[PDB]
Amino acid sequence: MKVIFLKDVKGKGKKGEIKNVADGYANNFLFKQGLAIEATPANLKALEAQKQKEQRQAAEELANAKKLKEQLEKLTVTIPAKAGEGRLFGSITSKQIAESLQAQHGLKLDKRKIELADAIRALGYTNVPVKLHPEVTATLKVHVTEQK
Amino acid sequence: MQKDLHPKAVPCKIIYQGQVVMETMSTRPEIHVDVWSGVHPFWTGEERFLDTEGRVDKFNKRFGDSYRRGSKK
RNA sequence: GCGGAUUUAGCUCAGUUGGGAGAGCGCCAGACUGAAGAUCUGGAGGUCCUGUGUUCGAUCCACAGAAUUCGCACCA
RNA sequence: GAGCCGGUAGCGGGCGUGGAUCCCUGGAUGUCCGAAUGGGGGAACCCGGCCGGCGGGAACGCCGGUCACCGCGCUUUUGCGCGGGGGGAACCUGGGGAACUGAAACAUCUCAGUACCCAGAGGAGAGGAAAGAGAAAUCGACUCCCUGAGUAGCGGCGAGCGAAAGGGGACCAGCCUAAACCGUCCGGCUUGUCCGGGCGGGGUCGUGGGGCCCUCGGACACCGAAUCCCCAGCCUAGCCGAA
RNA sequence: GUGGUUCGUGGAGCCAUGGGGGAAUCUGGGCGGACCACCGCCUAAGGCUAAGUACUCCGGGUGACCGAUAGCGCACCAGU
RNA sequence: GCGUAGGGAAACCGAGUCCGAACAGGGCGCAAAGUCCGCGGCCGUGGACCCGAAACCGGGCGAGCUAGCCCUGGCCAGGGUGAAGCUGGGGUGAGACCCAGUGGAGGCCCGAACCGGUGGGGGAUGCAAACCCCUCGGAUGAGCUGGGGCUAGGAGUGAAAAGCUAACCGAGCCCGGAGAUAGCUGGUUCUCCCCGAAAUGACUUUAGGGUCAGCCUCAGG
RNA sequence: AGCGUAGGGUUAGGCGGGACCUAAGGUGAAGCCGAAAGGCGUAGCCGAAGGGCAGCCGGUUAAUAUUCCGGCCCUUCCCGC
RNA sequence: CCUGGUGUUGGCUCUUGGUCGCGGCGCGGCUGGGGGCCUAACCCUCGGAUGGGGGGACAGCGCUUGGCGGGCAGUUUGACUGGGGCG
RNA sequence: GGGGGCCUGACUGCGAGGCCUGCAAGCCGAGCAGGGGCGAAAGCCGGGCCUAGUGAACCGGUGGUCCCGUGUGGAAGGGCC
């Protein structure tokens, strides 16, 4: 039985799970129900088509987390707020993160990313391992300052 | 004609007849019966060109049913 | 005659570690009885189907014949 | 080419060479039944919508025409426009399909795939360019006649049944489409690359078709029809016609 | 498990199929009579195709064919 | 296509061959050669010397036959017998229960039409393919019935003998297999010449058939 | 002569059948099952001295008659008001 | 008519048997028996609609197995024989 | 016909030539060859003293052949013993 999956087999995993459900068995109860279909070359193309589409959405987004990547890991990270002699009066959040560099420096980037224990403040040079792409990120430099 | 398949015929003929073998494995065989009977499948419900339901049997049924060569479901 | 089932004491049968030949009996006897029966005691019961072979050693393992029994194979 | 109102010869009356009787072919009527079909029904009868004159409607209102069964395609829209079905002596294939009787019984066998019934095509259907035949590396459509052959062979090896290639002959004759490969699109999913159906490519005769790259190459090859008059044959009477 | 075939169960194939499994797209896939090697043939699982053979209701022709109890039974107000 | 060699299961050999390992026999060699045709006595397939039955098998044909069953009407002149009941009276508590009145059932009795058809009479080329005469049973009932229909003939129906199914159903009737087979039965034609039979023996699901012999006849040596 | 030839005879708004109704049963669009022919079969329809429906008495010919005469009794449809 | 395997006759779990391999037990592939509501076929159900309800892997029903089986169908059941038979 | 000695011809290939005979059967048999046994040897031996102890042909088993083998190599299968 060329069972073209679409969810379960234990659950739902509609991921390349062809399983000899068997004759009318798997035939009637599984898809009569509506949960995938049979070989049908059309599909046996359908699965590979969209597994290839998925293949563009990953390596691409790979090429999208590799462009900002290098361009990003080279230049600075300047944000001179106010302060006294250490620390700022309103710490420094990766929230104030985005806002700046973006608008200013330019390219849009998240604010859930960047690996921040808390709201620094120590102004000046203090790098921040910023999680950009799932496997590859950006431990960039950050030089703040109380422009006074 | 209302006892066939739609997706092909298969009804009729059937020249049965039993005997009492006992050959090649020694000596020779014999004869008897002289009857004639039927022999066929079964039918399920479908539909085409505004309702119709269909019928035809297994085999075939497993087919067109899956697909449909003149009307689907 | 194609196949399966088995073979030891008078009868019916156990017997697998390859080394003791065993049980029951029913049968015989003793005890008991007025006797016999019933009970208790005891005893016997040998071509382990035959032959040959294997083995230090054969009821047991190997090789033909057999017999009994059941099913089947029947167009000389 | 000059007689006629049929077989009726009879009474009573009449058409005709300013081409009657009749011979031809194409006509218009074709009452009621019958597949019947508008509806019903014991056939040859009795009943209904639309149009219809308007008709005696003497100062009072009808037949005629019509129309329409149902299964078939499908311009689907509310479906408008095409085919069928009923026949038919014999012959045709399919669908189904038997005892007698022979075997000097009779269960195998035979009569047979006959007789019959059913469906359906035609004027002929049947069949028909080969996953064929056989073995000389030989043959080639199908069919039919002779022959092969009462042979090879089937079998209570009994009664019987009993092929074919090859050779001779009649005839000849070849073609298509799914056949997703290409492009065209139309409709969907839901945008891609899926299935879909109309247009061509090709649309295979004896192994090819596409798609790519260079040689191409630049008019006689008509089929089962399609067509024109042609001799259109016949279609009944055509008409001379030696003494 | 039946068919047809000369094949009546047979050493018994090809083609056709009643039920059940359910391959390949040219070194593919049947075939040449169980099967197997090698050789040889063919390319299926859609379709159309006049002509060559069969049959007389019809019309004609012809008769070592008849003559009214023969011929079709029925030669003429007969399938009555 | 028969003859031109054949011999053999065959391979195959071949005027020789198969058995075999032996010159012992079987088949044949030895040409005598046919072959086609015509005309005949015959033999096989044929319906095939001619008519003859009971039956089997196919497709139709019928409940205005009759047996049923469904639907729907009609029909049983008179009379007789007298159960449930209800009314009243009756010794006990009520009653059982008795009696008397009324009352009117029952596949009930006596009997017409109507349904039938034992028991005798006639009739026997009848009046008639079941009828006439005298006689008899049933006579509100598994009652008789008209009209409408349903079933069906290897199948129906059947208060059931194998009955009835268009006047003889032990499996209807018509057309078809078909002119079934038919050791049995008959039937089997103009003259004349010639000779002249058997009625036994052997084997038969064979004995009143027929194979082979024995006895006939014609052609040549 | 209930035999031959010839001529002639039976008339209905109200009698019967239809122009109304259904049971059996038969048909039968749909629906259901057959190798084919076919089987069944809803609703609707067919189906009768069962249901329903508006008259009777006398006269009058060679024959008819509740129809023809006449005297008496009615019904349904239509148009008008 | 009864009957094994097979089919459109789908899920979930409870289990014992064989087997060969690595009296045994541990495992392992193999495969056999079986017990369960379910349930999406199937069928039936209906009860006022197409939804519900009930059975449910049944069974209907198809294919092969085997069995009963005079209900029916078709044949048969010798000769002799100083009559047919019995003998 | 009664014992004892070794011995098995209780043979293959064949049989001239007859008995009985419609059929098929049935039955006999010198002698020829290969190969033995018994006897010195001349010879006898192809079961019995006989005449009953029986069966067609097909339907098959099996030990031998290496005859056929359905395109050739073979085998299923078949023919012959």
Q: Please indicate the count of domains of chain A.
A: 2
> Quick one: how many beta strands of chain B?
0
Biggest sheet character of chain A: 2 strands, parallel
The 3D shape of chain B can be described as: elongated
What is the number of helices of chain A?
A: 4
Biggest sheet character of chain B? none
CATH homologous superfamily identity of the largest domain in chain A: Ribosomal protein L9, C-terminal domain
Straight-line N-to-C gap of chain B: 23 Å
Order of helices and strands of chain B: H
Sheet-strand content of chain B, in percent, reads under 5%
How helical, in percent, are the residues of chain A?
25-40%
Helix count of chain B equals 1
Quaternary organisation of the protein chains: part of a larger assembly
PDB class: ribosome
Keywords: ribosome, translation, release factor
Entry title: Crystal structure of the whole ribosomal complex.
Chain A: 50S ribosomal protein L9
Layout: helices, strands, pairs:
This is part of a larger assembly, with chains A (148 residues) and B (73 residues).
Chain A: H1 23-32, H2 41-64, H3 67-72, E1 78-79, H4 94-102, E2 128-130, E3 138-140, E4 143-144
Parallel strand pairs in A: 1-4
Antiparallel strand pairs in A: 2-3
Chain B: H1 62-65
The structure holds 7 RNA strands.
Describe the structure.
- This is part of a larger assembly, with chains A (148 residues) and B (73 residues).
- With 148 residues, chain A is mainly alpha-helical.
- Chain A folds into 2 domains: 1-59, Ribosomal Protein L9, domain 1; 60-148, Roll (Ribosomal Protein L9, domain 2), CATH 3.10.430.
- Helices cover 33% and strands 7% of the residues of chain A.
- Chain A has 4 helices and 4 strands.
- The N and C termini of chain A lie far apart (75 Å).
- By secondary structure, chain B is mostly loops.
- Chain B has one helix spanning 62-65.
- The longest helix of chain B is centred in the C-terminal third of the chain and has 4 residues, at 62-65.
- Chain B starts with 61 loop residues before the first helix and ends in an 8-residue tail after the last helix.
- Classes of the chains: A mainly alpha (148), B little secondary structure (73).
- Chain B binds 7 RNA strands through loops.
